[PDB]
């Protein structure tokens, strides 16, 4: 069956894991638990096609650097996550995307920009800001909340659809 | 506020109305009730942007012909609907798209191909078939069921996102 190798990347603490666990295990992880590296494989049906989602959940931190090249080389699509209440994480998105482009030698790699934690009332990143950045990248922008489950399937299924028509 | 003028088109009986009513009124219309023309306006928030969805629900039938040019000229995005248990409706998709392209003098108009009634076990149109047609058009393919609500928000929000980066 078609397998889609999805990679979730973004700054420490933005909700990479919480989004992934919501998708795979249907619950909000409300606890501090930093990732080193985790993978999740799940059989799903998306728009009638039977497929397997092979998801790598990554660490946002330092050492990784070249350990990042490795998973960026084999990933087919990337969810680029920032948190709407954390401006530095939104600014960090550019470094992740430049790094993906260099390793893939490509200026169009399937990618979705995700503004997570939209359930929080204190936003520091306006939707408009994120929206212009995504359009400058030519990629979709989706806001999500791993807490309410808002936009979670939408964010991952839109990425599969981006891979499908690459 | 940003308004998005969405138009739902497709053959008689494929579920144009049922999809629209699911979105706006949250209930499945399980009755025979042919459309002449209906419009629905609703304020929503999509990916953090406050906007108004102005939706025209159209008739699939004959007279319309030039009455179609009229609403195709002002529509910004089109949901092109067929039913997965009705092959003629899938074949009719091509005439609707050619007609949209001619009136808009454009080969890329925001559009989503929707295979509705995916809750039914007797499909006559394979997902694979629909998927290759959408990719040949360069547009997303989404399967939906107005009965279960599966994919309904996804189909309309993906169309808004297509308009946003046109
Ligand atoms: N309100 C709210 N909290 C969230 C959301 N997503 C994650 N969180 C919280 O934010 C914190 C970090 O979440 P986590 O998923 O571990 O982030 P991460 O990006 O995976 N961290 P790491 O890079 O270390 O691997 C946790 O306390 C988690 O519960 C969200 O959508 N809304
Ligand atoms: N099982 C199932 N039935 C559906 C679905 N969508 C619509 N129907 C049924 O199919 C029939 C036609 O639905 P309707 O929404 O009126 O189709 P239409 O495309 O709007 N017809 P018209 O072109 O005449 O305006 C109705 O009996 C309706 O309940 C669906 O997703 N699943
Ligand atoms: Mg994590
Ligand atoms: Mg109707």
From Swiss-Prot, chains A, B:
Question: Sites of glycosylation?
Answer: 35
MF term (GO), any: GDP binding
Describe the reaction catalysed, as an equation.
Answer: GTP + H2O = GDP + phosphate + H(+)
Name the consequence of residue 119 to N: Loss of GTP-binding activity
Q: What result is annotated for mutating residue 38 to N?
A: No effect on interaction with PLCE1
Record-listed N-acetylmethionine modification sites: 1
Q: Where in the cell is it found?
A: Cell membrane; Golgi apparatus; Golgi apparatus membrane
Outcome, altering residue 118 to S = Abolishes S-nitrosylation. No stimulation of guanine nucleotide exchange
Q: What is its EC number?
A: 3.6.5.2
The protein's topology relative to the membrane is: Lipid-anchor
**Documented effect of changing residue 32 to F:** Loss of interaction and recruitment to plasma membrane of PLCE1
UniProt entry tagged with the keyword Lipoprotein: yes
Indicate which residues the UniProt annotation says bind GTP: 13-18, 29-35, 59-60, 116-119, 145-147
User: Which positions does the motif Effector region occupy?
Assistant: 32-40
Pfam families named in the record: Ras
Q: What does this protein do?
A: Involved in the activation of Ras protein signal transduction. Ras proteins bind GDP/GTP and possess intrinsic GTPase activity.
Subunit description: In its GTP-bound form interacts with PLCE1. Interacts with TBC1D10C. Interacts with RGL3. Interacts with HSPD1. Found in a complex with at least BRAF, HRAS, MAP2K1, MAPK3 and RGS14. Interacts (active GTP-bound form) with RGS14 (via RBD 1 domain). Forms a signaling complex with RASGRP1 and DGKZ. Interacts with RASSF5. Interacts with PDE6D. Interacts with IKZF3. Interacts with RACK1. Interacts with PIK3CG; the interaction is required for membrane recruitment and beta-gamma G protein dimer-dependent activation of the PI3K gamma complex PIK3CG:PIK3R6. Interacts with RAPGEF2.
Name assigned to this protein: GTPase HRas
* Name of the coding gene: HRAS
């Amino acid at each position: 069956m078609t397998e889609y190798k999805l990679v979730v990347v973004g700054a420490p603490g933005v909700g990479k894991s919480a989004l992934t666990i919501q998708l795979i295990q249907n619950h909000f992880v409300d606890e501090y638990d930093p990732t080193i590296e985790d993978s999740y494989r799940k059989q799903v049906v998306i728009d009638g096609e039977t497929c397997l989602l092979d998801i790598l959940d990554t660490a946002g931190q330092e050492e990784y650097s070249a350990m990042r090249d490795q998973y960026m080389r084999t990933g087919e699509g990337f969810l680029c996550v920032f948190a709407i209440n954390n401006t530095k994480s939104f600014e960090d998105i550019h470094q992740y995307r430049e790094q993906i482009k260099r390793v893939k030698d490509s200026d169009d790699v399937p990618m979705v920009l995700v503004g997570n934690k939209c359930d929080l009332a204190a936003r520091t990143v306006e939707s408009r800001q994120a929206q212009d950045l995504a359009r400058s990248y030519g990629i979709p922008y989706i806001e999500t909340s791993a807490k309410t489950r808002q936009g979670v399937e939408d964010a991952f299924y839109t990425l599969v659809r981006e891979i499908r028509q690459h």
